[PDB]
Amino acid sequence: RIKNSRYESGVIPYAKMGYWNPDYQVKDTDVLALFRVTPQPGVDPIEAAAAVAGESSTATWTVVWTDLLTAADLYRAKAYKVDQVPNNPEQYFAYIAYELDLFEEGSIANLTASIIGNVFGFKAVKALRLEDMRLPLAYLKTFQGPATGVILERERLDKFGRPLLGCTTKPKLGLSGKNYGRVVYEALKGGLDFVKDDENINSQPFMRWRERYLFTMEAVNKASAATGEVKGHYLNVTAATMEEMYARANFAKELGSVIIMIDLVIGYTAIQTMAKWARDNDMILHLHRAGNSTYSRQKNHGMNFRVICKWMRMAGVDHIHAGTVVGKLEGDPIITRGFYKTLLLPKLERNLQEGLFFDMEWASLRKVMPVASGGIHAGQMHQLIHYLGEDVVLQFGGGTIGHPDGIQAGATANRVALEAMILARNENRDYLTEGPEILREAAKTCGALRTALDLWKDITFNYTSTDTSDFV
Amino acid sequence: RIKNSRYESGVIPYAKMGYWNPDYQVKDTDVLALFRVTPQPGVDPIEAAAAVAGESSTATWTVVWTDLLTAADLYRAKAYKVDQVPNNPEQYFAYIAYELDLFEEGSIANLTASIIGNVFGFKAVKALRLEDMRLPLAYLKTFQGPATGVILERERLDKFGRPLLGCTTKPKLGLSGKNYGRVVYEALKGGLDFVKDDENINSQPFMRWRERYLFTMEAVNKASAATGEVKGHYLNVTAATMEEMYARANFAKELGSVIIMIDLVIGYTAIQTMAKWARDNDMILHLHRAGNSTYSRQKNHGMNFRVICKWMRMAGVDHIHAGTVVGKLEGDPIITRGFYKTLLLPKLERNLQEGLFFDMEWASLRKVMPVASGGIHAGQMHQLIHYLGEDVVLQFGGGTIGHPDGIQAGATANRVALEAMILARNENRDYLTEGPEILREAAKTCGALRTALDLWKDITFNYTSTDTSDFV
Amino acid sequence: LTASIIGNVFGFKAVKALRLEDMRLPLAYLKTFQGPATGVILERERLDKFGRPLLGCTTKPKLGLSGKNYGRVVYEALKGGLDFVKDDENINSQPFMRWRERYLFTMEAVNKASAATGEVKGHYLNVTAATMEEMYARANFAKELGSVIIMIDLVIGYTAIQTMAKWARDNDMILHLHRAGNSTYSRQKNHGMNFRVICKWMRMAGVDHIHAGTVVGKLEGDPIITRGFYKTLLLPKLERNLQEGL
Amino acid sequence: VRITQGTFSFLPDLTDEQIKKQIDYMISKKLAIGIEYTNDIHPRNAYWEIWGLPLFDVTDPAAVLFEINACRKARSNFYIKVVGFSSVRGIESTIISFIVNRPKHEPGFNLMRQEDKSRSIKYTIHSYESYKPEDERY
Amino acid sequence: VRITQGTFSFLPDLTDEQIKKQIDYMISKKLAIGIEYTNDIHPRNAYWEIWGLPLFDVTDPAAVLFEINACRKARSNFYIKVVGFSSVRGIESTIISFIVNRPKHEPGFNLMRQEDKSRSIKYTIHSYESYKPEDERY
Amino acid sequence: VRITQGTFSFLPDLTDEQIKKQIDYMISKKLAIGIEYTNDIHPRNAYWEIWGLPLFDVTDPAAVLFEINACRKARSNFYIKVVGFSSVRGIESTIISFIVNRPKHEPGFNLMRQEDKSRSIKYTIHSYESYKPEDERY
């Protein structure tokens, strides 16, 4: 017969449905998410937080009796704390807790389908941003983590104590396979550890992929024999279908490449599939975060990149681009520091200034190597070491190929600059302040660096950051 | 020896590098993109448009001589028109043209790697939104298009002349396989054409996937025998890896399911791989746009959903959620109309009010069936038919299961409401205005509908749309 | 394409004669085709030979040599200065010489010649066979031995050619087409199909080399009409020229 | 059961007055109108018998009504439906199909469950009347 | 042996007079001119060392002759070749490559025959001089 | 060639004064310090010979300098490197490795190109000195 209680048909607000509970005690097995909620005028912040919690877990817009056929009370997500954002009356920070049982083990797709599935287009919320997440130890252990990881990567390369140096081949599009290999040989022989395909170099009318792989591997091995170093080039296996990606990855495997690269734009399932492949085939997997800033640039809506850093460290990627503070792409020093910590550290401590809202143990999953790329040049070296630290791949595309005396000279300039800088750091010199002089001193012995310092001397990228801290 | 010309080392602005050309004549083979650019204070709009064009095609921050080894002039993308946005002095509409040769045939991943790859995080641009794209006939023909398509879908279902009716099972999470099948049987027998898994129902502790598939197919076939109709349930094959997705899809295939569903969150390569699979295995493929509003909600940054509609019609999906105007999720009537036209029409005409900035022929690729879902109920039927038209799947989750007299009764209410409404439309009655009365008249014969109309009578979702037209 | 254009109309009683002269294949249709597996530019890069025509040689007598003797001729010609030597179109696998011997002995000769000259050398191993599986077997053995090139005969047909063009692209193999049987329909001005049409269809299909005639040799080749063929194969855009039949 | 194949089968059986208005709709959309019938209403029975040849350029609804009534007179214990086809390039298909005649009593369908591998079943739906020869149904 | 890589290597070694005429040909075709060298003439050694940066808009042949002679002076016992590149859309590649300097005596190549499955052999060609370190060749 | 394995090998060979400062860095980070040597500098030669046992709790840099100089005295024509290991849980690896001794002249490496399927090559890099027995190198 018809029901008569909390489960009788009708619309009641999400806060009354059980998704708002300020007294909830966070269980160590819960997935916690922090949202920056801007409710519509007239919507109570608590109701908006409850609406987000409800629609990312079990609720719909009207009461459904079928809840009674489940342990409904356990499966409902609970918003347990709503605070106002420091200097913005419209925005609120809502802490929501989700039960472990709601998620499929080892699946980024299932996690995102609940957390970012529908709630960002909910009419009652004017804007919504996912800021951070606490992923519990028990959930983290169902994920592979980095295929190689920083530590093993450095052991396979026999390169320790300094950042690694890379370079995107330029022009972005248009070179042939033969010419791509030319650039790779020159840059690696000149002193770079790695060179890479640009993210949009895949297989096109001007150059199909098999030529590039064959010619690049010739160049990599020639450079290795010319230097006595392990060298590599990120062969881009991004493709339209999984079978086509596997074909490219397996050919790179056959040729003995130490590394391959994929673009975020292939999507989460393809990334997870390639992370497993890389672990099983002793291949370093580099992720280029193509498309990331489509949702991470604005403070009021989208997803903050530290969340993507957690999901990708979970997925199993070995490198991810995490920004340069001083380059041509967006990177506020304090927020970028948070990203680097997320990728490199065994345990994250809550620090409101960096936007790290939760303490989180990483369940001994391997470390992701951050990649710093875009509009950087020697000269900025002292502050690159200062903001990004030791475990990072510094990539100089234009900063190498744009050098007037040739690509080898560009590569040497960058390599000498790097080494002189961490030598000075290790000698306990205040390299931040003395930096211009350290570089100038090294330039006296290395003409290539002198010319690089003169050329790009005044190039700076002073612009106001969009993604900033709320506690400064 | 060192160069001396346009290719001598140094930094010159992107407009001087060849990416700004107001006299460029658009070739019919070009991929055209429209960006809404908000430059940083002090950056000239033309330089910002040129910067976007440059970095999505061939440029880097400094001059590289290697351009000379390519047909550089052809490969450079050209911003050819910059107009100011009607009531916003900070925003500009920039029209950029890209040569066909820059793209890999049949690959959404390669297209996006150039267009949305890096430019959205470029420091010089404060905000950036991709509004629309003109994809040329010659590029469109390298794509499969919908596996089934609207026309063939209706032929396989033997259902024509009316919208199709669906329902997401509720609660979102927590039901067992056995109970999921119960809900499916009741709703389909009661009159719905389809029922579906919720986007986050995949394989979890409370219910693994094989039980749900087995029990659901029993329910689907019982409902079919009970009605004399072809019935279906969207089995969700979303999973962490491609192999796991194939396993789920192939089991659905083995059991004779007419349809499966995937979530946008699996990513572009996995979607393209499943679109091919669906074509080869006579399976209707439904896409749920999970995660879409993370980048499509705000007018100043991200990507407008009509772009995703084009990319997914290209990829090969058969259904995609395109919004309800009157439901719980965001949907401005004029902008939503543009989305529906993009999915259903053979040729798109430029209409600034809908945000359709380009005329575009669809190269006879099949039509995607729009899905309208979220917070809708019978009662809104007359305006659902009015805004969404005939070719749409109307999905009532809460609108079916939340009915006091049971799920069968909920389903009947929705089905009778639909049929009475398009009968009235076909009789040339002004169903928009007479709608409440048409429903009231049908309710006299169908008690289930009477109760549904009474229950949700005053439920409306009046909120200000964020994604609005600029020409109203 | 051919099933519609040349399917039935050439035997239509009302038409006494009919010849397909030329076709304009639209940009949008052309993009659904692979085109040459290697193509002239990449071919020359893999061979490191630029600025001059390449030189080849069909082994003679056409039929009758053993595998061992075929390899002798290949070694001598390549060492002497030819870039390529080839199987004759009707050399496949016969009582006097089966294919595996010829492939093994030829590759020994190719590598000896390469070491003797400092050049990349090759021999067109003919993979033409009765069934697709047998062709794949021959092609894959040539692949295993490191041959830079293989050859097929037009006579295997369009589906087999397209299948091999894809194979060549996927396996970094230069694919040479010998137009065996072509002049059965292209010789007479009043009926059949002009060879420039076959040139378009084969550039579309994905072949890397096709015989296009010598003006001064033993086979038919009018200078002006042959020029049209060469333009069809080599140029990025074809301009209407009534004298060449374009 | 009540077979709910057809665009308006959850509504009462349409009167000739209602059918006439639907034919006006088909005429305004320049549809070819076809009348089809069967006594095997299996959902997958894609090809019902055609009553003559589809009426192509119809100006007067009464012509179609005449043929519907002629079919009803000759096939009283059959399912009869009216189909409207659009030859427009993106469509080239049926855009409306509704039942205009039903037999006096519909038995329903039998569901066969053949056990296959593990818990998988292969299903056969078969209308009870189609266990009788065609001439003896309904 | 005489290495016959290069467009004119079956002819006598070109005199500066002959080279000048070839550079005029490259200039009339608006080619970028590059000078490359190595002491590893393996046929598959795709990347010889570049002598500087390719000369792009060359009007005077003497400029190129000067660089060829400068390379010959600094790398006397190396193979040196002149390369002409065309940036034209259908090409974007080298269209001429010829040797302008050879060491006094070329040893040739060793052929390694590794026995693999059945009668299949895997071959390694290696120049005899490349068994010596780079600084000690020729 | 100059072998550029090691953290500071694009810089001049470090003086004992510079090495001492690097050892101070290793001591402040509580690293175990190891001294290793070889005359096979193949990049993939993961295990160089250990000179004794790694010095674990080092307070005085002079102790390490003494052992570096003792190794240099006993292995003058060998590559010698100093390695710093961190036992900290996330790391448990080498965090610095730099060359402190090089032989007077380095020949370089030979590159072998074995032709495999189609245009695929299998490569062998081998140092020229490792074609001589161990006791006769450098």
Ligand SMILES: O=C(O)[C@@](O)(COP(=O)(O)O)[C@H](O)[C@H](O)COP(=O)(O)O
């Ligand atoms: O395409 C580019 O612009 C880059 O190759 C840099 O080139 P340059 O070194 O020549 O500037 C990198 O992919 C961007 O750094 C990606 O951005 P992010 O690192 O922020 O993901």
Ligand SMILES: O=C(O)[C@@](O)(COP(=O)(O)O)[C@H](O)[C@H](O)COP(=O)(O)O
């Ligand atoms: O999960 C939900 O909320 C729904 O199942 C609707 O449930 P109700 O029918 O019970 O409201 C849909 O997936 C949303 O419509 C998706 O949003 P969009 O259609 O905008 O993609």
Ligand SMILES: [Mg+2]
């Ligand atoms: Mg890049």
Ligand SMILES: [Mg+2]
């Ligand atoms: Mg849903």
Ligand SMILES: [Mg+2]
């Ligand atoms: Mg012959």
